[PDB]
Amino acid sequence: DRVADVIESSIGDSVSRALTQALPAPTGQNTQVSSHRLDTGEVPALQAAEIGASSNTSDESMIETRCVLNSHSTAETTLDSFFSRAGLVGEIDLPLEGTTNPNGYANWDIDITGYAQMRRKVELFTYMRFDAEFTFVACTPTGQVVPQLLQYMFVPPGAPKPESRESLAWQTATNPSVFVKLTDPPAQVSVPFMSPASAYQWFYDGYPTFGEHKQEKDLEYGACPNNMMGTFSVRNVGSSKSKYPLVVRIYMRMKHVRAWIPRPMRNQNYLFKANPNYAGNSIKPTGTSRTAITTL
Amino acid sequence: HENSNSATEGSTINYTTINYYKDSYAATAGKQSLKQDPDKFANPVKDIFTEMAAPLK
Amino acid sequence: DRVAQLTIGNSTITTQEAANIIVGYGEWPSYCSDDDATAVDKPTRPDVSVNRFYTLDTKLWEKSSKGWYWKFPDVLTETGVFGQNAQFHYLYRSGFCIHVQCNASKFHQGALLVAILPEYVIGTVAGGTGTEDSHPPYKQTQPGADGFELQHPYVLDAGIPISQLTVCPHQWINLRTNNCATIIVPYMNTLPFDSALNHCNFGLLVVPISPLDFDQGATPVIPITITLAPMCSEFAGLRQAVTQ
Amino acid sequence: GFPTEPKPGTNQFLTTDDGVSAPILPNFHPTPCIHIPGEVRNLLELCQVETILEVNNVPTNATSLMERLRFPVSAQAGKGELCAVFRADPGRDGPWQSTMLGQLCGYYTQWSGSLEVTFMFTGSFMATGKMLIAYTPPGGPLPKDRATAMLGTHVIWDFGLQSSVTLVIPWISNTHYRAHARDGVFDYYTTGLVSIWYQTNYVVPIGAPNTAYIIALAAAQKNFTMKLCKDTSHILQTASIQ
Numbered sequence: 113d114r115v116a117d118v119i120e121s122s123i124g125d126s127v128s129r130a131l132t133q134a135l136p137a138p139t140g141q142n143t144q145v146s147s148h149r150l151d152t153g154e155v156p157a158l159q160a161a162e163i164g165a166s167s168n169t170s171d172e173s174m175i176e177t178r179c180v181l182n183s184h185s186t187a188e189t190t191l192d193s194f195f196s197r198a199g200l201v202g203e204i205d206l207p208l209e210g211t212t213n214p215n216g217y218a219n220w221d222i223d224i225t226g227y228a229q230m231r232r233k234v235e236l237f238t239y240m241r242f243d244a245e246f247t248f249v250a251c252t253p254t255g256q257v258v259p260q261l262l263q264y265m266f267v268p269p270g271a272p273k274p275e276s277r278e279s280l281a282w283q284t285a286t287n288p289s290v291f292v293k294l295t296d297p298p299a300q301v302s303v304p305f306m307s308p309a310s311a312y313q314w315f316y317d318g319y320p321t322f323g324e325h326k327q328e329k330d331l332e333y334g335a336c337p338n339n340m341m342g343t344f345s346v347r348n349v350g351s352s353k354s355k356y357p358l359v360v361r362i363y364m365r366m367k368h369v370r371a372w373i374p375r376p377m378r379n380q381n382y383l384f385k386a387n388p389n390y391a392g393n394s395i396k397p398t399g400t401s402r403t404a405i406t407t408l
Numbered sequence: 409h410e411n412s413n414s415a416t417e418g419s420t421i422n423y424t425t426i427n428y429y430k431d432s433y434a435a436t437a438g439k440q441s442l443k444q445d446p447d448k449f450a451n452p453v454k455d456i457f458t459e460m461a462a463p464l465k
Numbered sequence: 466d467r468v469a470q471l472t473i474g475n476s477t478i479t480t481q482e483a484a485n486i487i488v489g490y491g492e493w494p495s496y497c498s499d500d501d502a503t504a505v506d507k508p509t510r511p512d513v514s515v516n517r518f519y520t521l522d523t524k525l526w527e528k529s530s531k532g533w534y535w536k537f538p539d540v541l542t543e544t545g546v547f548g549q550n551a552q553f554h555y556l557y558r559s560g561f562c563i564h565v566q567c568n569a570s571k572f573h574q575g576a577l578l579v580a581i582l583p584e585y586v587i588g589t590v591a592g593g594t595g596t597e598d599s600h601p602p603y604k605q606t607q608p609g610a611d612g613f614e615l616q617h618p619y620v621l622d623a624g625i626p627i628s629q630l631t632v633c634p635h636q637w638i639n640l641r642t643n644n645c646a647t648i649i650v651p652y653m654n655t656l657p658f659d660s661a662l663n664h665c666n667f668g669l670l671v672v673p674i675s676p677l678d679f680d681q682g683a684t685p686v687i688p689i690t691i692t693l694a695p696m697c698s699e700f701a702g703l704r705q706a707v708t709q
Numbered sequence: 710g711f712p713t714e715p716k717p718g719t720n721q722f723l724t725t726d727d728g729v730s731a732p733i734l735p736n737f738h739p740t741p742c743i744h745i746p747g748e749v750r751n752l753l754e755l756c757q758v759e760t761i762l763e764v765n766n767v768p769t770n771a772t773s774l775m776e777r778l779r780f781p782v783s784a785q786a787g788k789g790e791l792c793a794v795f796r797a798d799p800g801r802d803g804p805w806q807s808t809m810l811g812q813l814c815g816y817y818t819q820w821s822g823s824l825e826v827t828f829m830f831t832g833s834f835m836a837t838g839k840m841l842i843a844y845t846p847p848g849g850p851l852p853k854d855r856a857t858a859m860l861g862t863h864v865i866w867d868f869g870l871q872s873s874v875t876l877v878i879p880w881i882s883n884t885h886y887r888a889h890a891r892d893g894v895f896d897y898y899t900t901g902l903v904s905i906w907y908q909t910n911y912v913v914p915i916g917a918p919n920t921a922y923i924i925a926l927a928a929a930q931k932n933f934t935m936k937l938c939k940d941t942s943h944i945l946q947t948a949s950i951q
């Protein structure tokens with residue numbers, strides 16, 4: 113009734129065959145007693161790195177070990193323990209006089225790739241899914257706390273970005289906004305995972321649009337819109353110039369973190385936001401160097 | 409009850425969190441299950457071999 | 466365990482000096498679940514006509530070679546029926562079986578690191594000084610089947626250490642031990658399907674960590690050939706053929 | 710209202726405090742999570758993956774950076790000559806800085822557990838030889854000769870079909886955990902020293918290279934653990950990132 117290669121066919125299997133399983137490991141593995149072993153045929157110490165797998169040799173087979181009941185916790189190395197720590201990811205200036213946002217408002221493009229510490233950590237993984245907690249610390253350039261009322265507004269991509277302090281966009285009929293005084297403790301808020309993808313990508317090896325990819329448009333290489341969450345806008349809630357110069361530091365704490373595919377950790381200094389460019393004339397070694405290989 | 413909109417919804421891992429709002433992505437990070445899968449990166453070989461054996465036979 | 470045969474489609478690979486097989490992240494390629502999918506149109510699963518071994522260009526290993534790389538969905542977009550489907554369809558999905566082969570003699574020596582780096586984004590030297598925001602050209606980000614040579618292998622042309630590249634599915638070709646590396650990669654991306662033209666899921670890196678060497682008289686031409694086969698290929702969103 | 714009394718710590722913003730925060734988007738539901746390969750659950754999963762250890766961290770030249778990834782071995786004079794040496798300290802400036810383990814350590818103040826270093830010989834099939842890799846626990850000064858190095862934990866490696874050998878640096882410490890070792894007072898947490906010696910000699914026939922290289926790969930054992938998060942010693946940035 114039906115061709116055999118179609119019946120016995122396996123095209124369509126949606127379940128991923130996994131060769132490994134995640135086991136409970138709340139503490140470091142214990143060490144078991146070991147005695148001398150003088151025999152042929154069994155060679156724990158000999159490996160073959162070509163295979164691409166790490167050595168499975170254990171302490172017990174290399175030396176005579178005692179019994180150690182290891183009760184050291186492995187909890188502080190979970191993804192949440194590692195990433196759930198607020199760090200600086202943005203900094204906005206609202207000076208009185210200058211060429212940088214001198215009209216009492218600013219539009220910060222949401223990108224946590226502007227600061228090395230936070231950036232290097234997250235770039236340890238290729239993909240990451242998480243909720244976050246944003247905290248906004250505001251004050252003057254001297255650290256002085258001033259009696260000023262500010263308005264922070266999240267402008268998702270597509271919404272109208274304010275063009276002035278008195279822009280109509282500040283009506284926030286739908287965008288989420290926060291009104292705080294610099295005298296109040298830093299505003300804090302919870303953000304969900306808002307990407308149209310299943311996770312954010314710190315690395316996107318491709319282009320966002322089709323067509324010819326000429327020199328002028330190489331600016332778009334590695335730009336993934338699934339990571340472009342919109343803009344963060346700030347302003348003096350008023351219609352006149354503020355009496356003080358302001359600064360807003362943005363901190364981010366990740367929660368409910370999932371991460372996939374680890375990568376080599378940043379080796380060279382960061383230069384730009386949208387890419388991994390490095391100074392070709394100042395390529396420094398990963399670490400420290402010495403005089404001779406036979407001397408410390 | 410409460411909205412199930414946290415980033416870890418439908419994950420094969422248990423969490424103990426605290427919350428005061430209807431949206432669960434606002435909950436604390438909480439504590440989590442300590443499962444690990446070293447072999448996934450350290451021994452992703454098709455035909456596994458013992459440590460007592462000579463890798464290449 | 467040193468010998469092996471890989472048969473898929475109408476192609477067969479043989480080897481008598483292998484070093485087992487690596488299955489990237491401990492997962493075999495599979496088709497897309499009905500709950501992981503979004504595109505509502507029924508996909509095409511050409512099977513045998515696209516899931517077979519394609520042998521791309523050969524490279525010459527010199528005592529001074531730095532290394533090469535190939536972006537993957539890409540290397541095949543202009544070859545066989547796989548390429549045609551990748552051009553006619555908007556969405557593509559698939560795993561790969563990569564087999565890098567390179568043989569010498571019992572008197573030659575050297576070691577190649579063969580690794581798979583997902584989302585392998587290329588960076589530039591930034592004009593040397595690091596003040597110029599330059600970007601890699603299309604010819605370098607998506608080199609095609611001819612692959613591309615690394616200018617600064619130590620940092621993988623992306624500011625990251627090659628010494629840690631082993632956290633990725635890899636294998637070595639140590640001439641005194643084996644003459645080929647086999648790595649099976651599942652479909653990895655944050656989406657169930659994606660464009661085979663605009664996006665390159667991962668990159669294949671073949672880099673000499675221990676320089677090739679031999680005494681004058683032994684054959685000096687030592688090639689490195691790349692053979693690869695798609696697995697569980699699925700395409701959707703049919704239209705006219707698009708090259709890029 | 711209900712009688713309350715705010716205590717010290719009121720209004721403070723503790724970077725690592727794990728509390729609740731008002732959600733900005735009511736009833737928002739995230740994109741479903743597809744299945745993605747290579748998911749990580751704990752960083753210790755990465756500390757067990759071997760990465761190249763730069764034992765030959767000597768060349769700093771622009772063109773010679775790729776040679777820090779492997780060190781030479783060659784025909785000698787047969788007097789148990791020294792090949793290479795390096796500290797076993799994971800979170801210390803030196804060879805371990807090139808490894809993933811060394812990098813992840815930088816993010817933790819303390820660690821505990823056995824370490825392992827696998828050496829892969831990349832000479833020719835016709836090349837033979839036996840080496841003696843020794844690990845000298847704390848207090849033991851850099852062994853002056855092989856006869857002194859062999860008094861500590863060691864392994865005699867014989868080159869053959871199995872290209873590699875694994876030196877296990879057993880956890881031999883006085884304290885349960887070790888903080889990162891540095892010069893001076895914190896050298897209290899030193900792990901010891903590793904040194905490769907020629908057990909016999911690198912022998913080869915006519916027609917085969919007189920010099921071959923060894924590649925060292927390092928990682929942690931199953932009993933390895935880390936605690937007390939901190940920032941890495943280095944920040945890869947000089948001026949603002951544009």
Ligand SMILES: CCCCCCCCCCCCC/C=C\[C@H](O)[C@H](N)CO
Nearest residue numbers: 222223224264265266290303312339341
């Ligand atoms: C007053 C309300 C303010 C609300 C602010 C909400 C901010 C939500 C930020 C989500 C940020 C996700 C960042 C993830 C990825 C990076 O943007 C990309 N890797 C940059 O290339």
Ligand SMILES: [Cl-]
Nearest residue numbers: 798799800890
């Ligand atoms: Cl240390």
Ligand code: NA
Nearest residue numbers: 126495496498
């Ligand atoms: Na699947």
Ligand code: NA
Nearest residue numbers: 155156158459
């Ligand atoms: Na073994």
Ligand code: NA
Nearest residue numbers: 167168169930
């Ligand atoms: Na091990």
Ligand code: NA
Nearest residue numbers: 139140142182
């Ligand atoms: Na235990």
Ligand code: NA
Nearest residue numbers: 274275276279
């Ligand atoms: Na306006």
Ligand code: NA
Nearest residue numbers: 300728729730
């Ligand atoms: Na709060």
